[PDB]
């Protein structure tokens, strides 16, 4: 996260840090708890990953330092990638992680509600992006979870900032014309929480952007509302 500040412990109870154990353990991506056994994250976070066995999901974490060899975590039983996904910049950058065990909700770890289709007309003016990502272009994973308040921009506005790209309605952007605040590498999979009428909603999933926090270069996120049907279908038992 560029231009943000340290979050308060438990401030974003749905935020998780996804680690890979190969070659040695490290933070890989952010993610959001949306169900007792489900983490919603970005598809492009599993590039080169051929098994959920090397994945570990840690919930209720503020500082990466809290994670040690003796820290409990949730194993991943299955990685579900949207079958239409090719690459972050082309859309469909969404994935579900089915946990091996159930998450016991508490003040430190709880789910974030998904957007309602009848909320596409809603104007979120209190949106935040969080993560342990880079604080600048060339940086490293941060110890303390960062947060930054960033305004959403219209797709037409976004498309105008990414002429060589195709900003579809399945994407949503957020940024300041002058830049300064934005998600970055390491925040991928992160949630783009917006609080509307005292209720937090998972509006987007950190996906991509040209550099980080550059002027006239909004962050691009997966437009979650466009995937509620997909999420429902994939999280069923059938
Ligand atoms: C794993 O995900 C990414 O590669 C990756 C690469 C990016 N864009 C870059 O240009 C970049 C930033 C830092 C280091 C780096 O090498 C690059 C190419 C990203 C930019 C944003 C955003 N601005 N909202 C968010 C997530 C990103 C994830």
XYZ file of C-alpha atoms and ligand atoms in Angstrom:
266
model
C 0.000 0.000 0.000
C 1.426 3.358 -1.065
C 0.659 6.505 0.916
C -1.232 4.702 3.656
C -0.807 4.247 7.410
C -0.647 1.427 9.952
C -4.021 -0.174 10.626
C -5.464 -0.794 14.089
C -5.460 -4.446 15.160
C -8.795 -6.027 14.259
C -9.767 -3.033 12.114
C -10.093 -5.266 9.029
C -11.069 -8.670 10.504
C -11.798 -10.096 7.042
C -8.254 -9.468 5.769
C -5.969 -12.513 5.646
C -2.359 -12.968 4.584
C -1.797 -15.891 2.219
C 1.667 -17.435 2.480
C 3.497 -19.954 0.338
C 6.027 -22.293 1.969
C 8.143 -22.685 -1.183
C 11.027 -22.360 -1.302
C 10.874 -20.826 2.180
C 7.768 -19.305 3.760
C 6.751 -15.787 2.756
C 3.655 -13.636 2.263
C 2.242 -14.185 -1.237
C -1.065 -12.329 -1.428
C -3.890 -10.731 0.511
C -7.380 -12.231 0.650
C -10.798 -11.799 2.281
C -12.838 -14.096 4.510
C -16.304 -14.383 2.956
C -17.415 -17.667 4.505
C -16.507 -20.102 7.293
C -14.380 -22.095 4.855
C -13.886 -19.538 2.086
C -11.303 -16.925 1.184
C -11.899 -14.697 -1.853
C -8.696 -13.558 -3.558
C -7.053 -12.867 -6.948
C -6.515 -15.596 -9.539
C -3.145 -14.237 -10.660
C -1.888 -14.918 -7.142
C -1.415 -18.604 -7.927
C 0.979 -18.266 -10.856
C 3.382 -21.204 -10.756
C 1.346 -22.822 -7.993
C 0.391 -26.394 -8.834
C -0.771 -27.473 -5.341
C -2.688 -25.983 -2.366
C -0.308 -27.970 -0.151
C 2.254 -25.157 -0.120
C -0.360 -22.580 0.894
C -1.102 -21.286 4.390
C -3.813 -18.805 5.320
C -3.345 -16.705 8.444
C -6.283 -14.774 9.881
C -6.437 -12.152 12.616
C -2.961 -10.908 11.769
C -1.779 -7.308 12.090
C 2.002 -7.759 11.974
C 3.791 -10.355 9.858
C 6.047 -10.786 12.913
C 3.150 -12.561 14.642
C 3.689 -15.403 12.185
C 6.267 -17.965 13.299
C 6.737 -21.717 12.905
C 4.430 -22.247 15.898
C 1.646 -19.943 14.692
C -1.587 -21.687 13.709
C -2.946 -21.306 10.180
C -5.602 -22.678 7.845
C -4.563 -25.187 5.214
C -6.025 -24.845 1.726
C -7.986 -27.828 0.444
C -8.784 -26.426 -2.983
C -7.895 -23.510 -5.242
C -10.751 -22.460 -7.510
C -9.758 -20.172 -10.395
C -12.384 -18.624 -12.694
C -12.266 -20.750 -15.870
C -12.327 -17.556 -17.937
C -9.230 -16.131 -16.276
C -6.131 -15.677 -18.440
C -4.392 -12.716 -16.823
C -5.041 -9.893 -14.384
C -5.143 -7.222 -17.064
C -7.801 -9.147 -19.078
C -10.254 -9.496 -16.199
C -11.729 -12.480 -14.357
C -8.949 -12.057 -11.803
C -10.820 -13.859 -9.045
C -10.222 -17.071 -7.128
C -11.692 -18.945 -4.198
C -9.712 -20.834 -1.580
C -11.583 -23.635 0.165
C -9.989 -24.089 3.586
C -9.258 -27.529 5.054
C -10.834 -26.431 8.336
C -13.556 -24.009 9.395
C -12.783 -20.487 10.632
C -14.181 -19.698 14.096
C -15.425 -16.112 13.937
C -14.364 -13.604 16.586
C -13.642 -9.879 16.883
C -10.257 -10.591 15.258
C -11.536 -12.617 12.301
C -14.968 -12.378 10.680
C -16.394 -12.341 7.141
C -17.083 -9.301 4.997
C -20.436 -9.162 3.210
C -20.521 -9.377 -0.565
C -22.145 -6.563 -2.581
C -25.793 -6.972 -3.549
C -26.734 -6.728 -7.238
C -29.231 -4.078 -6.200
C -26.270 -2.074 -4.941
C -24.645 -1.393 -8.318
C -26.293 2.031 -8.274
C -24.882 2.691 -4.812
C -22.142 5.290 -4.518
C -19.481 4.201 -2.050
C -17.660 7.284 -0.754
C -15.822 5.549 2.098
C -13.610 2.944 0.424
C -10.292 1.608 1.747
C -7.613 -0.692 0.350
C -5.477 -2.715 2.756
C -2.432 -4.970 2.636
C 1.169 -5.824 3.479
C 2.335 -4.808 0.008
C 5.031 -2.466 -1.270
C 5.040 1.130 -0.023
C 6.683 2.068 -3.336
C 7.534 0.602 -6.765
C 10.722 -1.207 -5.729
C 10.196 -2.224 -2.115
C 9.404 -5.239 0.055
C 6.594 -6.830 2.045
C 5.640 -4.722 5.065
C 5.398 -5.971 8.640
C 2.316 -3.971 9.626
C -0.945 -4.140 7.668
C -1.374 -0.800 5.863
C -4.591 1.031 4.974
C -5.419 3.891 2.626
C -8.664 5.671 1.840
C -9.095 5.896 -1.912
C -12.001 7.235 -3.985
C -13.600 5.155 -6.713
C -13.458 6.515 -10.269
C -15.952 5.809 -13.051
C -15.032 3.174 -15.628
C -15.068 5.793 -18.389
C -12.582 7.797 -16.347
C -10.470 4.719 -15.734
C -10.500 3.620 -19.376
C -9.196 7.047 -20.274
C -6.182 6.439 -18.016
C -5.509 3.035 -19.580
C -5.893 3.634 -23.324
C -3.922 0.528 -24.271
C -6.202 -1.594 -22.106
C -9.818 -2.641 -22.006
C -11.519 -1.593 -18.759
C -14.680 -3.732 -18.677
C -17.685 -3.472 -16.366
C -16.230 -6.478 -14.532
C -13.486 -4.168 -13.290
C -13.634 -1.194 -10.959
C -10.975 1.450 -10.385
C -9.940 3.691 -7.520
C -7.380 6.442 -7.301
C -6.526 10.122 -7.009
C -5.930 12.101 -10.199
C -2.669 13.228 -8.601
C -1.828 9.736 -7.335
C -0.111 9.307 -3.975
C -2.315 6.547 -2.537
C -2.773 3.130 -4.120
C -2.419 -0.629 -3.717
C 0.822 -2.194 -4.963
C 2.646 -5.500 -5.487
C 2.043 -7.687 -2.442
C -1.459 -6.269 -1.900
C -2.814 -8.489 -4.696
C -5.871 -10.418 -3.648
C -6.442 -7.682 -1.093
C -9.992 -6.498 -0.431
C -11.284 -3.080 -1.448
C -13.663 -2.497 1.445
C -16.329 0.186 1.193
C -18.577 1.163 4.139
C -22.064 2.128 3.044
C -24.662 2.900 5.696
C -22.545 1.421 8.485
C -21.996 -1.833 6.628
C -18.713 -2.903 5.081
C -18.871 -4.462 1.633
C -16.242 -6.249 -0.431
C -16.434 -4.025 -3.519
C -13.214 -5.049 -5.207
C -10.193 -7.326 -5.201
C -6.755 -5.757 -5.725
C -5.753 -6.832 -9.232
C -3.383 -4.532 -11.143
C -2.181 -1.105 -12.187
C 0.625 0.665 -14.041
C 3.232 1.069 -11.330
C 1.822 2.250 -7.996
C 0.208 5.548 -6.991
C 1.334 7.322 -10.168
C -0.681 10.363 -11.206
C -3.501 9.535 -13.625
C -3.028 5.791 -13.066
C -5.909 4.423 -10.921
C -5.607 1.011 -9.320
C -7.682 -1.619 -11.100
C -9.758 -4.061 -9.080
C -12.028 -7.003 -9.786
C -15.626 -5.758 -9.604
C -16.905 -8.287 -7.064
C -20.624 -7.603 -7.558
C -20.207 -9.004 -11.078
C -19.244 -12.352 -9.547
C -21.854 -13.025 -6.859
C -23.514 -15.646 -9.080
C -20.130 -17.239 -9.760
C -19.224 -17.220 -6.062
C -22.563 -18.782 -5.106
C -22.225 -21.526 -7.712
C -18.630 -22.349 -6.764
C -19.153 -22.361 -2.991
C -22.070 -24.814 -3.068
C -21.980 -28.552 -2.448
C -24.120 -29.821 -5.367
C 2.109 -10.014 -8.179
O 1.389 -8.891 -8.714
C 2.047 -8.004 -9.504
O 3.008 -8.243 -10.220
C 1.429 -6.675 -9.396
C 2.014 -5.584 -10.243
C 1.509 -4.238 -10.246
N 2.013 -3.110 -11.044
C 3.304 -2.733 -11.250
O 3.547 -2.003 -12.232
C 4.449 -3.186 -10.322
C 4.545 -2.668 -8.912
C 5.639 -3.114 -8.043
C 6.629 -4.029 -8.546
C 6.577 -4.563 -9.905
O 7.568 -5.432 -10.298
C 5.496 -4.147 -10.834
C 5.468 -4.758 -12.325
C 0.361 -3.944 -9.338
C -0.260 -2.600 -9.217
C -1.352 -2.384 -8.356
C -1.944 -1.033 -8.253
N -1.247 0.013 -8.580
N -3.261 -0.842 -7.805
C -1.909 -3.524 -7.535
C -1.390 -4.804 -7.586
C -0.246 -5.099 -8.462
C 0.351 -6.439 -8.547
